[PDB]
Amino acid sequence: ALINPQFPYAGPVPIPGPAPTETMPLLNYRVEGRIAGIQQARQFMPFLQGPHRAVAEQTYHAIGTGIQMGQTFNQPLINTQEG
Amino acid sequence: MDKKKLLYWVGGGLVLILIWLWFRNRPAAQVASNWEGPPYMTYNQPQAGSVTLPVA
Numbered sequence: 001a002l003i004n005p006q007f008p009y010a011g012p013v014p015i016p017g018p019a020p021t022e023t024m025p026l027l028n029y030r031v032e033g034r035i036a037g038i039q040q041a042r043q044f045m046p047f048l049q050g051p052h053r054a055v056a057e058q059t060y061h062a063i064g065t066g067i068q069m070g071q072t073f074n075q076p077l078i079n080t081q082e083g
Numbered sequence: 084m085d086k087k088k089l090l091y092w093v094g095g096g097l098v099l100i101l102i103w104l105w106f107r108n109r110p111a112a113q114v115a116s117n118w119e120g121p122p123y124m125t126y127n128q129p130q131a132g133s134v135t136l137p138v139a
Contacts, residue, residue, distance in 0.1 A: 072127030078134040 003009050086092075120128070129135065 068122070068124030070124065070127055072129075074127070074129060075133030075135060077136055080136060080139060 001009075
């Protein structure tokens with residue numbers, strides 16, 4: 001702010017002001033609020049809580065069976081070298 | 084005999100103990116199957132190479 005003498009800035013907005021209204025009042029709000037609809041315990045989703053496999057491992061079962069059977073052919077006898 | 088009174092009487096026990104152990108070891112093997120070929124279907128049986136013999 002600058003004040004300049006001799007033209008000085010009025011020393012106030014004075015008493016000639018026009019009170020325009022008495023509408024100043026905010027009427028307090030008084031209220032009762034009830035949000036009470038029956039609630040049912042459940043919601044349907046496509047899927048909740050699953051941690052789906054991105055790849056599975058290979059998996060398997062097992063079997064064996066049979067017996068011990070055989071047809072054989074042997075090497076001929078040979079002269080013994082030494083000993 | 085000149086036998087001291089010390090270690091050697093311990094030594095006699097040790098000798099006896101060693102001999103008993105050896106005999107048990109010698110006799111302690113079960114009369115059994117330890118020679119192997121425990122595959123009951125083994126009438127052919129040739130584990131190495133061709134041309135073999137059973138008595139000189």
